[PDB]
XYZ file of C-alpha atoms in Angstrom:
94
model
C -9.521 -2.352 -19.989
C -10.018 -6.036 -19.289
C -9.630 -7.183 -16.007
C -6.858 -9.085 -15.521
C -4.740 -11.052 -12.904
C -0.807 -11.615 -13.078
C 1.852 -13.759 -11.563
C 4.636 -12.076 -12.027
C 8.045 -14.007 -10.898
C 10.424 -12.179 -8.617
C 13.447 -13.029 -6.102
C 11.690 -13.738 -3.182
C 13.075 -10.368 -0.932
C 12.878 -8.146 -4.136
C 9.784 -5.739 -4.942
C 7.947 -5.813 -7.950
C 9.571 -2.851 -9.053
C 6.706 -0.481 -10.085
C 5.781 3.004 -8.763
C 1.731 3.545 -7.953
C -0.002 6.639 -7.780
C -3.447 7.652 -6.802
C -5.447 6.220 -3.755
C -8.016 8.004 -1.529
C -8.006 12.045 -2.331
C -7.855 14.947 0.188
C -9.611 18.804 -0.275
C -9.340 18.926 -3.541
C -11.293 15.400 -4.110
C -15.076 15.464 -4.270
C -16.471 12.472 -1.902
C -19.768 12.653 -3.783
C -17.820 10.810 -6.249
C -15.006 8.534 -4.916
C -14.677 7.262 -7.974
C -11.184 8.995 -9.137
C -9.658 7.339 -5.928
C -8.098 4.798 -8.136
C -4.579 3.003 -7.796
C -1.953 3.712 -11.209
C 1.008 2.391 -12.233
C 3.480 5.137 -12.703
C 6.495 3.933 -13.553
C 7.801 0.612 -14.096
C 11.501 -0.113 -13.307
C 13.276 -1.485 -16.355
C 15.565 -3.451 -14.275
C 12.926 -4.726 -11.831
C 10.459 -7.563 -11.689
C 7.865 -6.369 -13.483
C 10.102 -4.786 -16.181
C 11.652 -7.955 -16.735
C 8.476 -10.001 -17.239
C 7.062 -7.262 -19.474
C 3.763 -6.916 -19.286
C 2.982 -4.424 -17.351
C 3.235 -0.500 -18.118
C 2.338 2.943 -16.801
C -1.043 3.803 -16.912
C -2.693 -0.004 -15.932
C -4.852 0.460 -13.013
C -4.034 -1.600 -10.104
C -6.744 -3.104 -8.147
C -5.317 -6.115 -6.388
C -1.728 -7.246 -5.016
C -1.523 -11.065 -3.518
C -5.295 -11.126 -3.702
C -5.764 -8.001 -1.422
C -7.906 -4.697 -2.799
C -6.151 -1.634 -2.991
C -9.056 0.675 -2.164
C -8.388 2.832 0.325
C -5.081 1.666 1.870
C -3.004 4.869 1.950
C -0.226 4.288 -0.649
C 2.353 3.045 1.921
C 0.487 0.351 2.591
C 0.071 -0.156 -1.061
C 3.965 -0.256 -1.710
C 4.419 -2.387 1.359
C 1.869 -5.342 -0.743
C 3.959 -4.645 -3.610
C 7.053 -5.591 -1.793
C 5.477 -8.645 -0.336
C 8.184 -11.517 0.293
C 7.534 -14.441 -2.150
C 9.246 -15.624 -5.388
C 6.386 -14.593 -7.697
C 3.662 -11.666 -6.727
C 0.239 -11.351 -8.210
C -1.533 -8.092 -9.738
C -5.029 -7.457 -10.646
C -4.948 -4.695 -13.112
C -6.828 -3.010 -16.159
């Protein structure tokens, strides 16, 4: 799982095309160990950015978009980064 940052191209009002689960946990969580509040890619769009430039897949966890940590944004915020205007879009993953 080696950390990694990509700059994935996109048109510049498209998304990158990738669905995201995971973020902070409710009552069935344990916050003694916050540690399985983690960010996933779960599903990757063939027709969308990041299925066109082809690296990414389901199961990469997602720890950065546009420089910007995931960790506990609730996961509308976290689609909102990954729809960021711009006509690439960067991911920090593992």
């Amino acid at each position: 799982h080696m950390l990694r940052e990509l700059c994935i191209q996109k048109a510049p009002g498209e998304g990158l095309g990738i669905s995201i689960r995971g973020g902070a946990r409710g009552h069935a969580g344990n916050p003694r160990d916050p540690t399985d509040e983690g960010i996933f890619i779960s599903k990757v769009s063939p027709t969308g950015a990041a299925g066109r430039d082809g690296r990414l897949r389901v199961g990469l966890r997602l720890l950065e978009v546009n420089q910007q940590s995931l960790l506990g944004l609730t996961h509308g915020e976290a689609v909102q980064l990954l729809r960021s205007v711009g006509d690439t879009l960067t991911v920090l993953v593992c």
